[PDB]
A paper describes a structure:
Complex I couples the transfer of two electrons from NADH to ubiquinone (Q) with the translocation of four protons across the membrane. The L-shaped complex is structured into a peripheral arm that protrudes into the aqueous milieu and catalyzes electron transfer with one FMN and 8–10 iron–sulfur ([Fe–S]) clusters, and a membrane arm embedded in the lipid bilayer that mediates proton translocation.
The longer side chains were intended to occupy the position of the bound water molecule that has to make way for the flipping peptide bond according to our structures. Thus, while both mutations fixed the position of the peptide bond, the Gly/Asp exchange seemed to exert a much stronger effect than the Gly/Ser mutation.
Author numbering:
A (entry chain B): 2 to 419
B (entry chain A): 5 to 160
Amino acid sequence: RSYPAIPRIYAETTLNMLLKRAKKPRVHSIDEYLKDGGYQALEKALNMSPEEIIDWVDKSTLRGRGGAGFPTGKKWKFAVQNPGPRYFICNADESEPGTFKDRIIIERDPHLLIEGIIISSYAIGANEAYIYIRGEYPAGYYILRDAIEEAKKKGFLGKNILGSGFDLEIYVARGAGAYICGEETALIESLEGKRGHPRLKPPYPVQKGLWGKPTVVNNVETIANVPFIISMGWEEYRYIGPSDYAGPKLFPVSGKVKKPGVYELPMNTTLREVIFKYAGGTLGNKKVKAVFSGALDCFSSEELDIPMDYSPLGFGGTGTVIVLTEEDDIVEAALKIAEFYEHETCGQCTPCRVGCYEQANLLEKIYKGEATEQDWEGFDFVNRNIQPTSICGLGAVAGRLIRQTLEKFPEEWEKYRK
Amino acid sequence: EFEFPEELKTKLQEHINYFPKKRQAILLCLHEIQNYYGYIPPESLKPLADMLELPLNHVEGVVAFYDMFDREDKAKYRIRVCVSIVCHLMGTNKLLKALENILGIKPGEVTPDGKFKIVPVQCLSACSEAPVFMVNDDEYKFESEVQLNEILSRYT
Ligand SMILES: NC(=O)C1=CN([C@@H]2O[C@H](COP(=O)(O)OP(=O)(O)OC[C@H]3O[C@@H](n4cnc5c(N)ncnc54)[C@H](O)[C@@H]3O)[C@@H](O)[C@H]2O)C=CC1
Ligand SMILES: Cc1cc2nc3c(=O)[nH]c(=O)nc-3n(C[C@H](O)[C@H](O)[C@H](O)COP(=O)(O)O)c2cc1C
Ligand code: SF4
Ligand code: FES
Ligand code: NA
Ligand code: NA
């Protein structure tokens, strides 16, 4: 059938793994996927024990591509020490500013994700899996529903998959406008038919998740790695990039670059190489002022030689690279980040509820030159005090990027204070 | 007594039968109701609650929480305009100016015929193609007023 219109995001790969098909901006259906040896990794996996698959994913060094970089095998190991039934959830809520890596897998190579979900579900003994896709990805939703029906038709889903005795159904749930529903516990609340309110952790989902049962939540990009780990073996997968942070990674690059789009690169690539070697440098060859790692971190032009890995001194996060050049106003940019957190706090925690609101409200007065001395001191205090009592990552980081701009661009902030 | 037209009720029942538990279908049902009516009619929520076997206050709270649902304004076509960091940097204001020149409306307003509503939204995750907008389920990069006019002419 025909799907809703999708912008043709540029995609480029040095590894030809996650973007082998998804580098071409169109739906790749099951026949094209099968021609490339698709679903042969699933056949291999179903002839391995669940425990063996967990061991391979562990030894691969695969880390959570959702942005936190939690070791995937170790997450699965926590889940399977708890009695069943267990649930597998694919997180397709992708809503971080500048982050469009997951959608190109979903919309162009949905069978890569589906194969990954089936192998992961078998690995943790889940007979029910969910894809939670944000409401603003309607094309992704229809493409996944159609792809799941293709997989059923070819016997990759349903009861007794390929005589293995393993049963799996994959349900596709849609979001309805909330960034917070990507937080794994808020996602689970939404799947249960409720408001997306994060739960106090611990427990983690692997202990108590969907209907209080052991639940693994993994990001689209994380799951898309699983067929490669099985197909190549964990040893060969570890040859890709540095041996401590191995495998392909997708880098969504936007803002003031000549070639904005998604780059599949190894994680030993530097931020400078992403911008200048791959994304074609800056618009008008203007100097880089800052890189926003989505709404999480602000890196200065002095921090471009860092690796794009999950190391303490690495870029980390989603791999999201928003480039600002010498003429972009950092305070204007900080206001947009404040406006984002204002719009998305669920309001359960008092300092998050009031802090996200006041940070945006006061920074708007500062930007428009209407801020009193008390508004200035108020903004500083509020920015430092969103995190206290917070029960999820939103309250923990709502002031983080803005604080980094106050520390790294004091000259620009001072201009506004006058 | 408010009643769902049979063609809508059939779709809602399909959503409710899809998941292992009825209450999991709540967001797919509300998407379906908004698609049918051009908004969520307040009167629709009691019968939906009955079909989901949930309290009415549960359903009302869900409609209030999720930003895509609109109980205020009927609109045939929702023009979702990204107002987040990357689209702002790359020309959200040029897109909004072009929309005002063509349709005569600003963010939050509906055209007098009820055809178009401009809905300001957070990052639509198509940031490389900034500035981004949707027309219902269709998503586009804004290039210019002449290009936007051609796109909007396809929605009748
Ligand atoms: N991709 C996107 O669009 C978005 C991505 N994010 C990312 O979300 C990240 C924060 O996510 P969180 O889930 O709060 O991070 P986290 O570090 O608290 O947890 C990461 C994962 O590891 C698991 N985990 C952590 N400690 C564990 C333990 N002791 N036992 C078992 N499992 C454990 C969690 O359950 C979760 O699945 C940020 O780094 C940000 O980059 C945020 C918003 C949107
Ligand atoms: C406010 C908030 C929003 C999040 N949104 C997403 C999202 O859209 N997609 C995602 O995969 N993870 C998101 N996460 C991270 C998840 O909670 C979780 O860490 C991740 O889905 C686990 O998968 P991974 O280990 O494969 O990265 C979000 C976290 C927070 C705090
Ligand atoms: S920290 Fe903020 S977003 Fe997270 S649960 Fe608390 S109020 Fe909600
Ligand atoms: S900032 Fe507009 S689509 Fe991401
Ligand atoms: Na095809
Ligand atoms: Na796409």
